[PDB]
Amino acid sequence: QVQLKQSGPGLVQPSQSLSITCTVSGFSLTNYGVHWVRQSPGKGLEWLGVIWSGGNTDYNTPFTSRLSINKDNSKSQVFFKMNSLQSNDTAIYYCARALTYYDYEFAYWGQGTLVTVSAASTKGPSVFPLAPSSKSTSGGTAALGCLVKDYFPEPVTVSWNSGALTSGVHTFPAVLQSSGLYSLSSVVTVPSSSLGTQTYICNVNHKPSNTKVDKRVEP
Amino acid sequence: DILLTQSPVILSVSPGERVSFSCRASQSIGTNIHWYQQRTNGSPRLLIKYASESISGIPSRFSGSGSGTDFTLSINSVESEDIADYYCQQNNNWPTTFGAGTKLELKRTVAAPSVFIFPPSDEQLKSGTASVVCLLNNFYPREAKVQWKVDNALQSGNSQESVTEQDSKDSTYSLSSTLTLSKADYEKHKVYACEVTHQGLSSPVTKSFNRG
């Protein structure tokens, strides 16, 4: 099928530059233009630019001087680069493809790339168990979780049992602590009778720090 | 640039109801408008192109109408999976621009939270910090009160809350309140208590533990 897969999230220092790679499949770059859109708290969805089939680029007016899009057709790659970023450039960046080669109705999107702009430093999280017990048990159902503490920047991905456990999972939005580091918990409810038979593991992945931890959670 | 104004910002409806989102343009744009859905942690999803034209894979309950400056997205019978934000896009004038979006929230029957409590792990204690987590699971509506008490001393300012987005299946919310102390303070005390108030409870629910 048609897919757009962007490079992972990361930290970029103020005044520095941003680089994202969009790798496409299910179509050729020689036949479709690839667009770049961003989503920020300040301005919501903004169309940034486009590289067309034949290599021509268009940039939205406010970005003409600090934006360049390039591509490798043979590699099916599109490269987004933006200079001199300020903190308000913190946004999710998407590459996208329209229904027809010349149009702008975006039927296909990349998964997005959360870029944080900040002078600070990348820090991986610590993962601690939220162990099930009689105090997290009610009517044959036990709750358990993982505390993902003290990382920067957002985001972290959390799954359970390598993706095989999705039902009853709640991964809370991160909160920013006074330390300027993020923290979240991920929880899941299971039958309490499975606690003695089934292993429960939160798979934590903080891509900006290349930190992957698998945390086993036991009663 | 064309300004697209979506109003209201928040819509709250019950399942099975018809619902309409409005998109108004700062000048005529013909029928050059597209609509998008964004679910929690999702990328935008194309629902309608050119005011009214359908899109492959999009449920029939979604439709669109309008021309000129006034446009409408409609869901004839809302489901829980429709919980999302909705955006409009014009492309009659370069550059293509987007509305600020409308949030779609679902009503449902009151559901009291299940309340669970988690002491700090010995693991975390080795690091010199203690987190006590209080979980309020699958409740509606969103409003709730969590009050921490350590040895009958009311805690204030040393906890943080987080609430999930509305569940796309059962329309509920879940909440975590995390109380953070130093290892020393944690060791100086015995009783840790999370007291929960919610519309679905006929009296506050207290979940607590003694350290050890």
Binding site: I92, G112, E154, P173 | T40, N41, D85, K103
Partner: peptide, 10 residues
């Protein structure tokens, strides 16, 4: 306001 953590309006 758009929230980068959840990709949802808050």
């Amino acid at each position: 306001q758009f929230d980068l953590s959840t990709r949802r309006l808050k």
